[PDB]
């Protein structure tokens, strides 16, 4: 019932996707081998929405890990939960993209896309009823942006009626671990805006800002950053995995949060985010965590929402709580911040709740935010793209794979179209 086919593209996509299967496996109570050891019966009721029944009560995940290098799969397969994935799903090439959008989109991806499209076809036909696709990729690099965007277009034409979820991390000017990041970012968003109906715009520096201020961890590694973004993936897909007083499917979130077809680039968040020493000095009640969700610190994107206005925001609550407190808290946040909410919509705050909270926490909530402040991250990528493109810097490597400079100009026009669209409704 409403099966979602998972897909992991790129190095970062495989890492956060690996953490996604790890964190939800503990919620359902699955061993690393693949057997069920959960305590509640509701954990097994909606286990088929990601997993498949196998012999010996084993549950294999529908994770199609794709990458243009072989070493990435060795780290994922040799992980704690690396042994649960299917060996047939591990399909990969030999030659990497080398941080080039053209290689993964024309040459390295075209020879591999014929092999992976057969893998997703058999997985989609074996399900009872397909709901959507959950993608994890990165706008940086070549395999994530080039090949990861290309497979969605093939899946778009094959399944035009089904939704498309994409949890896409994107670069920032303060934290930039790649020289050719704006070209990969500017070309990828041209393909994402036409194909993907949903896009969670996550920024790396915000995850560094979240771990530094509210969590105050001493030595945050990449694994700690994956725990934050993986929890947001488990939070959006909570209503179709456990019962709740007000269920909201992933399509139900899309109808509420996508007022126009191009305005599907949102600002995710997660709460509570507390340190180990500051847990005793905090109440788990609903009003204190609600203001934390709407705070600029908790959001996983560098754009301050006070520089813009919210189009429409969603708060998918979890745990046993009072509905009146949820209904009254969503009122006061928009009342005393009416300047930061659009006047041409009477109510912008979507809400949902579930009965089964995460393991180790009694109550929690996940923030999804559509606002005009997200255009600030696009224009800084645009001026970085325009600064390097106006003298044809670092383009000759892209032209080797048959790519033309007109497509760079077309991606620049779409980038100008994105920032002007969010400025219209501001």
């Amino acid at each position: 019932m409403r099966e979602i086919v998972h897909i992991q593209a790129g190095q970062c996509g495989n890492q956060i996707g690996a953490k996604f299967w790890e964190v939800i496996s503990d919620e359902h109570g699955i061993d690393p081998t693949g057997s069920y050891h959960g305590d509640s019966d509701l954990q097994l009721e909606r286990i088929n929405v990601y997993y498949n029944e196998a012999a010996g009560n084993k549950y294999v995940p529908r994770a199609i890990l794709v990458d243009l290098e072989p070493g990435t799969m060795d780290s994922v397969r040799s992980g704690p939960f690396g042994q649960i994935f299917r060996p047939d799903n591990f399909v990969f090439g030999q030659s990497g993209a080398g941080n080039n959008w053209a290689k993964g989109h024309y040459t390295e991806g075209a020879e591999l896309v014929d092999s992976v499209l057969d893998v997703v076809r058999k997985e989609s036909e074996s399900c009872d009823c397909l709901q959507g696709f959950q993608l994890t990729h990165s706008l940086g690099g070549g395999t994530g942006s080039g090949m990861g965007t290309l497979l969605i277009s093939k899946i778009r034409e094959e399944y035009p009626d089904r939704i498309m979820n994409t949890f896409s991390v994107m670069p920032s000017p303060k934290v930039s671990d790649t020289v050719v990041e704006p070209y990969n970012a500017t070309l990828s968003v041209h393909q994402l805006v036409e194909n993907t109906d949903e896009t969670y715009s996550i920024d790396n520096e915000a995850l560094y800002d979240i771990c530094f201020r509210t969590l105050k961890l001493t030595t945050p590694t990449y694994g700690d950053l994956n725990h934050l973004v993986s929890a947001t993936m488990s939070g959006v897909t909570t209503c179709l995995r456990f019962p709740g007083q007000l269920n909201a499917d992933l399509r139900k979130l899309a109808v509420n949060m996508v007022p126009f077809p191009r305005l599907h680039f949102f600002m995710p968040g997660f709460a509570p985010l507390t340190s180990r020493g500051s847990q005793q000095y905090r109440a788990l009640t609903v009003p204190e965590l609600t203001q934390q969700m709407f705070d600029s610190k908790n959001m996983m994107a560098a754009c301050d929402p006070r520089h813009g206005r919210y189009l429409t925001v969603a708060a998918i609550f979890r745990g046993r709580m009072s509905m009146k407190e949820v209904d009254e808290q969503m009122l006061n946040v928009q009342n005393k911040n009416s300047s930061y909410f659009v006047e041409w919509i009477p109510n912008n705050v979507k809400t949902a709740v579930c009965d089964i909270p995460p393991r180790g926490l009694k109550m929690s909530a996940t923030f999804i935010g559509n606002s005009t402040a997200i255009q600030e991250l696009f224009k800084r990528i645009s001026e970085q793209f325009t600064a390097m493109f106006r003298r044809k810097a670092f383009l000759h490597w892209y032209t080797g794979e048959g790519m033309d400079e007109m497509e760079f100009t077309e991606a620049e026009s779409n980038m100008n179209d994105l920032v002007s669209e969010y400025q219209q409704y501001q």
Binding site: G98, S176, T178, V179, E181, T221
Partner: protein, 427 residues
């Protein structure tokens, strides 16, 4: 993933015997040729409990091949791979290319061909030589042109040893350097460079070796060339492939001449008294006196840079380090590339040689910086060439080999075009 490394000339093989001893010590390979997927990219599996490198030491003079054959690494290296010539190059670009070059390239070009058939993951090439003489200029340039017509698409990482402005070994070195660079400009995808006097400066102020030798110089070269390929041998938080040095450093197909520098460099007694974290090594690698080539980066502008780390190096602090480098207005990046940084992390730490001069450290960095600072070095190399070219000095040897005054002028105007591009791109 696999790669092969050839060596040419006295400078190449003296790096080859000095770097391969470091490679065999990392993977626990004893000197006798024996002790999973970490040593596969450099060493093959020779049946059962035995390995061999994927390399060939070729030189026209036999002075250097016989000592490696009768040295201490007799069983590690294959005896047939150690190719030896018959006649010396004599610091002549023409003699090591046409007279002595043409009769020996047919053996080595077919050898590396069949040596690639047993391989399957050949990522590219990296060569070791020096344009300060004849073998590393003539025979190398003939090898690059005949390999580019066969393979072409595969990468080539040139590691040449250029002379200092005033310090030198030969006297006819700019003729060999200017003639071979006419062919190396178009056939090389990337070419890192090293100077002979700057590396003495590395061991003088920091390591405090008042009487060093070429053995000590090659050990820190081995740390450099092994660090760039450390991502392929061992897993890391952010792995970088050998082809990453082509896309993220070469803005234009003829501007492919970056610099090199490495840190930390510290002696034994100073290693325990000095603190080792990512801040000072990030401040030290951009230091102009700690560079491996004599060029002032303050005069020029950086086109592209790439930072690759080793050992226990978390990613949150190194991103803060480069942020402090950007706001520092001492150096200045070019407006054509504001995001001129490529970060890389690896968990495997830097190793040390038994009895070596370098001390053990928990972390390190290798800084290869692309900039226009080499333009003044080339103009100085071209400036000293014009004084000798006007008097026709040392010309009777080259024309006695078969060449003439044509390619002398073609190398001059081609070097002039190289200067014309570096002043145009730096605007």
């Amino acid at each position: 993933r696999e790669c092969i490394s050839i060596h040419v000339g006295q400078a190449g093989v003296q790096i080859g015997n000095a770097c391969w001893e470091l490679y065999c010590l990392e993977h626990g390979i004893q000197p006798d040729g024996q002790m999973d997927d970490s040593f596969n990219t450099f060493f093959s599996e020779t049946g059962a409990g035995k390995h061999v490198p994927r390399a060939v030491f070729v030189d026209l003079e036999p002075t250097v091949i016989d000592e490696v054959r009768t040295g201490t690494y007799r069983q590690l290296f294959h005896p047939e791979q150690l190719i030896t010539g018959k006649e010396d190059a004599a610091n002549n670009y023409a003699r090591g290319h046409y007279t002595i070059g043409k009769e020996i390239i047919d053996l080595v070009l077919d050898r590396i061909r069949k040596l690639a058939d047993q391989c399957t993951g050949l990522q590219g090439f990296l060569v070791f030589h020096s344009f300060g003489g004849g073998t590393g200029s003539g025979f190398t340039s003939l090898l690059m042109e005949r390999l580019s017509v066969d393979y072409g698409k595969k990468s080539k990482l040139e590691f040449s040893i250029y002379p200092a402005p005033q310090v030198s070994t030969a006297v006819v070195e700019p003729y060999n350097s200017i003639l071979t660079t006419h062919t190396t400009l178009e056939h090389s995808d990337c070419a890192f460079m090293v100077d002979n006097e700057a590396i003495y400066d590395i061991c003088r102020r920091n390591l405090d070796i008042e009487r060093p030798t070429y053995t000590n110089l090659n050990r820190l070269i081995s740390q450099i060339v092994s660090s760039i390929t450390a991502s392929l041998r061992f897993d890391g938080a952010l792995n970088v492939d050998l082809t990453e040095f082509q896309t993220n450093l070469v803005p234009y197909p003829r501007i492919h001449f970056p610099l090199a520098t490495y840190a930390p460099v510290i002696s034994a007694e100073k290693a325990y008294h000095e603190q080792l974290t990512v801040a000072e090594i990030t401040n030290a690698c951009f230091e102009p006196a700690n560079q491996m080539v004599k060029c002032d980066p303050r005069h020029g502008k950086y086109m592209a840079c790439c930072l690759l780390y080793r050992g226990d190096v978390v990613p949150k602090d190194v991103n803060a380090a480069i942020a402090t480098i950007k706001t520092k207005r001492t150096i200045q990046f070019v407006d054509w590339c504001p995001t001129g940084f490529k970060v890389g992390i690896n968990y495997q730490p830097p190793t040390v040689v038994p009895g070596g001069d370098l001390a053990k450290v928990q972390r390190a960095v290798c800084m290869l910086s692309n900039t226009t600072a080499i333009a003044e070095a080339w103009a100085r190399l071209d400036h000293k060439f014009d004084l000798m070219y006007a008097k026709r000095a040392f010309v009777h040897w080259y024309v006695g080999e078969g060449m003439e005054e044509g390619e002398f002028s073609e190398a001059r105007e081609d070097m002039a075009a190289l200067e014309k591009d570096y002043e145009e791109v730096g605007a």
